[PDB]
């Protein structure tokens, strides 16, 4: 029947697949990897593709709210 989920800062398959796809299609050895994956993930920003992935890298991962880890940019 009916269904849907609204009200939870999250992406959608279309995005994910785009994030992963690109992330896969495109090399991670590249510089503006985000800018790239962001191309296909246009749906979102390249700076977000990181924040997103960071949460769901592959498995558990690591989250940080206060006093972020090592920052470089």
From Swiss-Prot:
List residues of cross-link (Glycyl lysine isopeptide (Lys-Gly) (interchain with G-Cter in SUMO2)): 30
Its annotated compartments are: Nucleus; Chromosome, Centromere
Q: Which domain of life is it from?
A: Eukaryota
Query: Start and end of every SANT domain?
Result: 8-61
Q: What does this protein do?
A: Required for recruitment of CENPA to centromeres and normal chromosome segregation during mitosis.
Listed under subunit, the entry gives: Interacts with SP1. Interacts with MIS18A. Identified in a complex containing MIS18A, OIP5/MIS18B, MIS18BP1, RBBP7 and RBBP4. Interacts with KAT7/HBO1. Interacts (via N-terminus) with FLNA (via N-terminus).
For this entry, the protein name equals Mis18-binding protein 1
Give the source species: Homo sapiens (Human)
Which stretch of the full sequence is covered here?
A: 877 to 936 of 1132
């Amino acid at each position: 029947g009916s269904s849907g989920s609204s009200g939870d800062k999250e992406w959608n398959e279309k995005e994910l697949q785009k994030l992963h796809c690109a992330f896969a299609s495109l090399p991670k050895h590249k510089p503006g990897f985000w800018s790239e994956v962001a191309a296909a993930v246009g749906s979102r920003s390249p700076e977000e593709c990181q924040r997103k992935y960071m949460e769901n890298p592959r498995g558990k991962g690591s989250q940080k709210h206060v006093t972020s880890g090592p920052s470089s940019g």
